[PDB]
Amino acid sequence: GAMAEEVAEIILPASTWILFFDASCSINSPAFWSTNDAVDRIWRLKIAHELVLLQVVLEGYFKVRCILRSSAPAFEMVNADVSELVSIVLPSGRLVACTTDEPTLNRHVLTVPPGRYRVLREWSVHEESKHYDVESAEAYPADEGPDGIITLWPER
Numbered sequence: 001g002a003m004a005e006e007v008a009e010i011i012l013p014a015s016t017w018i019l020f021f022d023a024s025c026s027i028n029s030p031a032f033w034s035t036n037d038a039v040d041r042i043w044r045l046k047i048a049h050e051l052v053l054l055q056v057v058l059e060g061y062f063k064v065r066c067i068l069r070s071s072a073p074a075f076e077m078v079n080a081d082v083s084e085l086v087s088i089v090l091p092s093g094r095l096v097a098c099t100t101d102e103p104t105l106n107r108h109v110l111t112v113p114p115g116r117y118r119v120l121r122e123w124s125v126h127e128e129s130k131h132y133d134v135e136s137a138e139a140y141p142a143d144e145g146p147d148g149i150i151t152l153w154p155e156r
Contacts, residue, residue, distance in 0.1 A: 006068040006110050009146060011137040013061050014099045017042070018054035020066075020109065020150065023094035025050050033103045042100075049087045052119050054148060061134035063145030066095065068112045069153045077122035077149045086119045087155055095152075116155040123148040 012018065019027065019042065026032050027045060045051040056062060067073075076083065088095075093114040098105040128147045134140050 001071060002074040003070040004067055005070060006112060007065065008110050009063055009065045010097060010107055010109060011061060011063045011140050011145075012097065012099060012105065012107060013059070013101065013137075014054075014056050015059035015101055016056065017100045018056065018062070018064065019051050019098050019100070020054070020088065020095060021045070021051040021098075022088075022090040022092055023096045023106070023108075024092045027051060027098070027103075028096060028106060030104070039100075049089050049116075052086055052088050052121065052150065054121065054123070054150070056128060057125065058129075058132050060128070060132040061137055061140050062128060062131055062147040063140060064097075064148050064150060065146040066109045066150045067152070068110060069151050071153050072118075072120065073151055077124065079124040079127055080122040080149075081125045082121075082123050084121045086121060087117060088119050088152065089116050090114055112152065117152040118155045120151040121148065122151070 095109040
């Protein structure tokens with residue numbers, strides 16, 4: 001039960017929002033960001049479960065582990081300070097990430113079967129606050145993090 005099926009980690013800088021979405025989502029195109037009120041249209045995508053939003057308190061470099069799991073995790077993230085159950089729709093199954101600092105990041109996270117997933121966002125503010133002074137992804141200490149874990153399992 002609760003079997004890890006696919007696992008990957010990304011390390012990226014961010015000052016406010018890390019955004020997870022299907023590669024086919026409108027946010028993954030320049031036309032989304034070239035027109036006004038992109039911040040309102042991000043929130044509408046979140047409301048519509050087309051993106052998942054990872055907020056950070058201050059600018060830093062953060063390690064995010066993403067897991068496709070057969071069900072909800074048997075063990076919570078050990079140092080998590082917050083846990084929220086949301087969902088995401090992935091019409092192509094290609095899960096990618098960007099930030100409001102780098103909208104063109106298009107960072108591949110995982111390729112999962114297309115469909116709708118329950119999503120657990122686990123985040124450690126304590127771990128996040130260790131990494132505001134990280135200069136680069138390469139300088140992120142290998143034995144530290146993840147600052148958060150994003151777990152997907154099929155919405156049934």
